[PDB]
Design an enzyme around this catalytic site. Structure first.
Site, PDB file in Angstrom:
ATOM      1  N   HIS A   1      62.111  57.552  51.783  1.00  0.00           N
ATOM      2  CA  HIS A   1      61.975  57.070  50.378  1.00  0.00           C
ATOM      3  C   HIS A   1      60.541  56.593  50.129  1.00  0.00           C
ATOM      4  CE1 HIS A   1      62.644  53.604  52.910  1.00  0.00           C
ATOM      5  NE2 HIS A   1      62.007  52.844  52.016  1.00  0.00           N
TER       6      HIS A   1
ATOM      7  N   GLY B   1      55.342  42.482  47.311  1.00  0.00           N
ATOM      8  CA  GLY B   1      55.868  41.639  48.427  1.00  0.00           C
ATOM      9  C   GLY B   1      57.112  40.870  47.970  1.00  0.00           C
TER      10      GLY B   1
ATOM     11  N   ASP C   1      59.939  41.733  48.206  1.00  0.00           N
ATOM     12  CA  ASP C   1      60.999  42.707  47.804  1.00  0.00           C
ATOM     13  C   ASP C   1      62.028  42.847  48.932  1.00  0.00           C
ATOM     14  OD1 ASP C   1      59.594  43.865  49.749  1.00  0.00           O
ATOM     15  OD2 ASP C   1      59.538  45.830  48.868  1.00  0.00           O
TER      16      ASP C   1
ATOM     17  N   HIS D   1      70.165  37.041  55.601  1.00  0.00           N
ATOM     18  CA  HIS D   1      69.067  37.196  56.595  1.00  0.00           C
ATOM     19  C   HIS D   1      67.740  37.580  55.923  1.00  0.00           C
ATOM     20  CE1 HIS D   1      67.364  37.951  60.542  1.00  0.00           C
ATOM     21  NE2 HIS D   1      66.607  38.872  59.939  1.00  0.00           N
ATOM     22  N   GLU D   2      67.739  38.551  55.043  1.00  0.00           N
ATOM     23  CA  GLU D   2      66.447  38.956  54.412  1.00  0.00           C
ATOM     24  C   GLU D   2      65.841  37.758  53.674  1.00  0.00           C
ATOM     25  OE1 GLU D   2      67.611  41.960  51.794  1.00  0.00           O
ATOM     26  OE2 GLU D   2      68.071  40.657  50.141  1.00  0.00           O
TER      27      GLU D   2
ATOM     28  N   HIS E   1      63.719  35.606  55.894  1.00  0.00           N
ATOM     29  CA  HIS E   1      62.338  36.106  56.147  1.00  0.00           C
ATOM     30  C   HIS E   1      61.452  35.776  54.941  1.00  0.00           C
ATOM     31  CE1 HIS E   1      62.887  38.114  59.931  1.00  0.00           C
ATOM     32  NE2 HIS E   1      64.108  38.509  59.559  1.00  0.00           N
TER      33      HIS E   1
ATOM     34  N   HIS F   1      62.541  34.989  63.398  1.00  0.00           N
ATOM     35  CA  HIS F   1      63.836  35.173  64.109  1.00  0.00           C
ATOM     36  C   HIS F   1      64.094  33.973  65.021  1.00  0.00           C
ATOM     37  CE1 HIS F   1      63.223  39.698  63.422  1.00  0.00           C
ATOM     38  NE2 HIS F   1      64.010  39.223  62.455  1.00  0.00           N
TER      39      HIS F   1
HETATM   40  C1  LIG Z   1      72.473  39.428  60.019  1.00  0.00           C
HETATM   41  O1  LIG Z   1      71.264  39.969  59.454  1.00  0.00           O
HETATM   42  C2  LIG Z   1      70.585  41.116  60.008  1.00  0.00           C
HETATM   43  C3  LIG Z   1      69.364  41.568  59.345  1.00  0.00           C
HETATM   44  C4  LIG Z   1      68.622  42.715  59.840  1.00  0.00           C
HETATM   45  C5  LIG Z   1      69.087  43.430  61.011  1.00  0.00           C
HETATM   46  S1  LIG Z   1      68.167  44.833  61.613  1.00  0.00           S
HETATM   47  O2  LIG Z   1      69.115  45.723  62.206  1.00  0.00           O
HETATM   48  O3  LIG Z   1      67.389  45.309  60.505  1.00  0.00           O
HETATM   49  N1  LIG Z   1      67.123  44.352  62.824  1.00  0.00           N
HETATM   50  C6  LIG Z   1      67.543  43.427  63.892  1.00  0.00           C
HETATM   51  C7  LIG Z   1      68.263  44.072  65.040  1.00  0.00           C
HETATM   52  C8  LIG Z   1      69.687  44.327  65.011  1.00  0.00           C
HETATM   53  C9  LIG Z   1      70.352  44.949  66.131  1.00  0.00           C
HETATM   54  C10 LIG Z   1      69.557  45.304  67.269  1.00  0.00           C
HETATM   55  N2  LIG Z   1      68.182  45.065  67.313  1.00  0.00           N
HETATM   56  C11 LIG Z   1      67.555  44.463  66.221  1.00  0.00           C
HETATM   57  C12 LIG Z   1      65.848  44.885  62.873  1.00  0.00           C
HETATM   58  C13 LIG Z   1      65.670  46.207  63.505  1.00  0.00           C
HETATM   59  C14 LIG Z   1      66.818  46.991  64.092  1.00  0.00           C
HETATM   60  C15 LIG Z   1      64.343  46.798  63.576  1.00  0.00           C
HETATM   61  C16 LIG Z   1      63.194  46.107  63.035  1.00  0.00           C
HETATM   62  C17 LIG Z   1      63.363  44.810  62.414  1.00  0.00           C
HETATM   63  C18 LIG Z   1      64.675  44.178  62.321  1.00  0.00           C
HETATM   64  C19 LIG Z   1      64.682  42.850  61.657  1.00  0.00           C
HETATM   65  O4  LIG Z   1      64.790  41.810  62.302  1.00  0.00           O
HETATM   66  N3  LIG Z   1      64.807  42.768  60.324  1.00  0.00           N
HETATM   67  O5  LIG Z   1      65.050  41.496  59.788  1.00  0.00           O
HETATM   68  C20 LIG Z   1      70.295  43.012  61.697  1.00  0.00           C
HETATM   69  C21 LIG Z   1      71.043  41.866  61.207  1.00  0.00           C
HETATM   70 ZN   LIG Z   2      62.639  50.668  51.758  1.00  0.00          ZN
HETATM   71 ZN   LIG Z   3      65.117  39.923  60.811  1.00  0.00          ZN
END
Ligand SMILES: COc1ccc(S(=O)(=O)N(Cc2cccnc2)c2c(C)cccc2C(=O)NO)cc1
Ligand SMILES: [Zn+2]
Ligand SMILES: [Zn+2]
Ligand SMILES: [Ca+2]
Length: 158
Positions: free
Chosen positions: A63, A87, A89, A113-114, A117, A123
């Site tokens: 995208h 930003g 977003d 969670h978002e 951040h 984290h």
């Molecule tokens: C409960 O809230 C959330 C929010 C985002 C994610 S998520 O998969 O994007 N995630 C964390 C992650 C998950 C499972 C295994 N390894 C890493 C991520 C992954 C996969 C890659 C890159 C960044 C994140 C991140 O922390 N975004 O906030 C998982 C759970």
């Molecule tokens: Zn995107």
């Molecule tokens: Zn995260």
């Protein structure tokens, strides 16, 4: 160190998901703001039209990003640091199954969670904290930011 320059913030939903009705998605985000607004003087106002600081939308694999989604599992969503422009977003995976019940990835869990951040939180190492890197289901009946998260957000915004 990183924080918003004001406690006033606005947001706009670009679209909902065919996975659930619009009403289910609307209340999902409202609950998320309530849980975060409970321990923070931040004010969130929905804008009927116009561009908002935090815009939420559902995207798909490619995208327009250097590292888009890796498929169904993986990045459930993503956001860019806060800023007076794009930003702050937040994008969600439209190829995943969004449900308000305890199935697949709950929209509320990723949504809360978002926002963490965007609040400048990193984290956490606590599995009971929402900022935990691994996705975990929790009872939203009375879930509240634990002491670890409360101490961090309070230390940043006071
Ligand atoms: C409960 O809230 C959330 C929010 C985002 C994610 S998520 O998969 O994007 N995630 C964390 C992650 C998950 C499972 C295994 N390894 C890493 C991520 C992954 C996969 C890659 C890159 C960044 C994140 C991140 O922390 N975004 O906030 C998982 C759970
Ligand atoms: Zn995107
Ligand atoms: Zn995260
Ligand atoms: Ca993914």
């Amino acid at each position: 160190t990183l924080k918003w320059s004001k406690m006033n913030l606005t947001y706009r939903i670009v679209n909902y998901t065919p996975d659930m009705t619009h009403s289910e998605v609307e209340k999902a985000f409202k609950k998320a703001f309530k849980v975060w607004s409970d321990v923070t003087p931040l004010n969130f106002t929905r804008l009927h039209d116009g561009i908002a600081d935090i815009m939420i939308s559902f995207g798909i694999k490619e995208h327009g990003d250097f590292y888009p989604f890796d498929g169904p599992s993986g990045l459930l969503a993503h956001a860019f640091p806060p800023g007076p422009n794009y930003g702050g977003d937040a994008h969600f995976d439209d190829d995943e199954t969004w449900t308000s019940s305890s199935k697949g990835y709950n929209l509320f869990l990723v949504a809360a969670h978002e926002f963490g951040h965007s609040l400048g939180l990193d984290h956490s190492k606590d599995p009971g904290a929402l900022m935990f890197p691994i996705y975990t289901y929790t009872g939203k009946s009375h879930f509240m930011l634990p002491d670890d998260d409360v101490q961090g957000i309070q230390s940043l915004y006071g």
